[PDB]
C-alpha cells in the first residue's frame, strides 16, 4: 500500500492570552517589606516562561525546586510570585532547607519547589552610599517561622528579664531597617529578590 507525509502545522488554541505577572516582579521598582512576602496569585495565563531565560546574569538562577527548565512548558495553576527586598546575608537563607538568620527569623522556604527563586543584588537600586536604612526586616522576631508562610504577622520578640510584654528592656524590634551600605559585602548589599 502507499502513503506517508510530513509537514508539521501546530496552529494552537490560544491567540493573544494575557502573559502573567511575570516581567512585573522580575522588573518591579518597589518590593514589599520582607516579612510581608508579596506573594500574589499570578494571573490567568500565558506564563510561557522563556522571558525567564533571556535575562542578564541573575547570580541566583539556580531553580530552587524542579530543574531551571520546563517551567514554560509545564502547566501549574499559579506559582504565587513573591516579592521582597533583602540584603545578601539574608539572601543566603532564601532556599529550600538552608535555614539561616532570616530563614531563621523572617523568611523561610519549604523542603523544595520554591518555584524558581531568582535573587540578585540591587546595589544601585535599594541603597545609596549614604548607607540606606530603608526597608524593615525582622531579626529577633521570635524564632524561625515555619516553611513558606506570609508574615505580615511580625510578632515581637520574647526577650525575657520581664513578664509584661516579653520584650526585654522594651520594644525588641522585629523591625530592622535593613541598614546596609554599598560599601559592605553583597552579604550586606541591597538585594531585591523574586520568589515563586
Amino acid at each position: 500500500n502507499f502513503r506517508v507525509q510530513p509537514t508539521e502545522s501546530i496552529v494552537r488554541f490560544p491567540n493573544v492570552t494575557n502573559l502573567c505577572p511575570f516581567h512585573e516582579v522580575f522588573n518591579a521598582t518597589r518590593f514589599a517589606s520582607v516579612y510581608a512576602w508579596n506573594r500574589t496569585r499570578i494571573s490567568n495565563c500565558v506564563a510561557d516562561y522563556s522571558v525567564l531565560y533571556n535575562f542578564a546574569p541573575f547570580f541566583a538562577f539556580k531553580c530552587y525546586g524542579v530543574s531551571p527548565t520546563k517551567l514554560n512548558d509545564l502547566c501549574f495553576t499559579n506559582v504565587y510570585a513573591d516579592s521582597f527586598v533583602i540584603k545578601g546575608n539574608e539572601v543566603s537563607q532564601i532556599a529550600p532547607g538552608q535555614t539561616g538568620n532570616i530563614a531563621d527569623y523572617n523568611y523561610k522556604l519549604p523542603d523544595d519547589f520554591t518555584g524558581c527563586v531568582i535573587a540578585w543584588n540591587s546595589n544601585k537600586l535599594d541603597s545609596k552610599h549614604s548607607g540606606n536604612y530603608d526597608y524593615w526586616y525582622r531579626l529577633f522576631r521570635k524564632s524561625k517561622l515555619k516553611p513558606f508562610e506570609r508574615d505580615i504577622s511580625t510578632e515581637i520578640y520574647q526577650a525575657g528579664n520581664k513578664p509584661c510584654k516579653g520584650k526585654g528592656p522594651n520594644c525588641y524590634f522585629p523591625l530592622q531597617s535593613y541598614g546596609f551600605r554599598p560599601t559592605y559585602g553583597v552579604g550586606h548589599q541591597p538585594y531585591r529578590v523574586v520568589v515563586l
Partner: antibody, heavy 126, light 106 residues
Framework: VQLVQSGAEVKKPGASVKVSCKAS????????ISWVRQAPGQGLEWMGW????????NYAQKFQGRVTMTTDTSTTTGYMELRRLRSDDTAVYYCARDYTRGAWFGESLIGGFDNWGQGTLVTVSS | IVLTQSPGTLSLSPGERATLSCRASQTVSSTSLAWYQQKPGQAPRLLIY???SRATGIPDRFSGSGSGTDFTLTISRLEPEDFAVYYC????????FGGGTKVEIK
C-alpha cells in the same frame, strides 16, 4: 518603561482629550497605570489610575466626569480622557504604573507609582 | 521615612533626556517633598519645591517627576548648569535629605 506619551496637546475650552500612553515593553495586562497632573508649579495633582488588567479606575473628584481614564488595550496606548479643557486647564499630566494600588483588585499594594509616562504637555492655550 | 537618590552616578551627556530616581519610601504627597540643588561642595539651593515643580531659578532643561516611593527626576536635555549636586528633600516626616544622584560627564 518608555510609556510613550503625547506632547504639546492642542485642546480647547470645551473639548475632550485623548492623551496617549503607549504601554511600553512590559506585559501590559499584569499592571495598572496611575496618572498625576503636574499643574505648573502645583507639584502633581492626583489624576487617577487605570487597571491595565480590567480597567478599575480611581478617578479624581476634581475631574469626576472630566477625567475618564480609558486605554487601547490592543495597541497598549493609555488614553486618560479629560473633558473640561481650557487655558486654566492647560496643564501637563503624566502616566505611572500604579503599584501603590496593585492592580487586578483596586487594592493598596506594596510599591509606589511605578514607571512613568513620557509626558502629556497639554497646550490648551487661549 | 526615607529617600533614595538611585542614580548616584547618572552619566548622561548634555543634550539628552535622562531619568534620576530619588525614590522615596512612603506614598508622600509632594506638597511636602522637594528638591534642593547644591553646587558640588556648597549649600543647597531651593531646587524643586513640589519635588517636580519648576520655580524662578530653574531653567527648562532641568526635568523631573515622581510620586509614591519611586520619584524619578526624568531630567531633560542636560547642561553643566544641571551638573551641580541635587538633593531631593522630604518636608514630610522629619526631613531626611538626599545624598546621591549627581549627573555626570564623559
Amino acid at each position: 518603561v518608555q510609556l510613550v506619551q503625547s506632547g504639546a496637546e492642542v485642546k480647547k475650552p470645551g473639548a475632550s482629550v485623548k492623551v496617549s500612553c503607549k504601554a511600553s515593553g512590559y506585559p501590559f495586562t499584569s499592571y495598572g497605570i496611575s496618572w498625576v497632573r503636574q499643574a505648573p508649579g502645583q507639584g502633581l495633582e492626583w489624576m487617577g489610575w487605570i487597571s491595565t488588567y480590567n480597567g478599575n479606575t480611581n478617578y479624581a473628584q476634581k475631574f469626576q466626569g472630566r477625567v475618564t481614564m480609558t486605554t487601547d488595550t490592543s495597541t497598549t496606548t493609555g488614553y486618560m480622557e479629560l473633558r473640561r479643557l481650557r487655558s486654566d486647564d492647560t496643564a501637563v499630566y503624566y502616566c505611572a504604573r500604579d503599584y501603590t494600588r496593585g492592580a487586578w483588585f483596586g487594592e493598596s499594594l506594596i510599591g509606589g507609582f511605578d514607571n512613568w509616562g513620557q509626558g502629556t504637555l497639554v497646550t490648551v492655550s487661549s | 521615612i526615607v529617600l533614595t537618590q538611585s542614580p548616584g552616578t547618572l552619566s548622561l551627556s548634555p543634550g539628552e533626556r535622562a531619568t534620576l530616581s530619588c525614590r522615596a519610601s512612603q506614598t508622600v504627597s509632594s506638597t511636602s517633598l522637594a528638591w534642593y540643588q547644591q553646587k558640588p561642595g556648597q549649600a543647597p539651593r531651593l531646587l524643586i519645591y513640589g519635588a517636580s515643580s519648576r520655580a524662578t531659578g530653574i531653567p527648562d532643561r532641568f526635568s523631573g517627576s515622581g510620586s509614591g516611593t519611586d520619584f524619578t527626576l526624568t531630567i531633560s536635555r542636560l547642561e553643566p548648569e544641571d551638573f551641580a549636586v541635587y538633593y531631593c528633600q522630604q518636608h514630610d516626616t522629619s526631613l531626611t535629605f538626599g545624598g546621591g544622584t549627581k549627573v555626570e560627564i564623559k
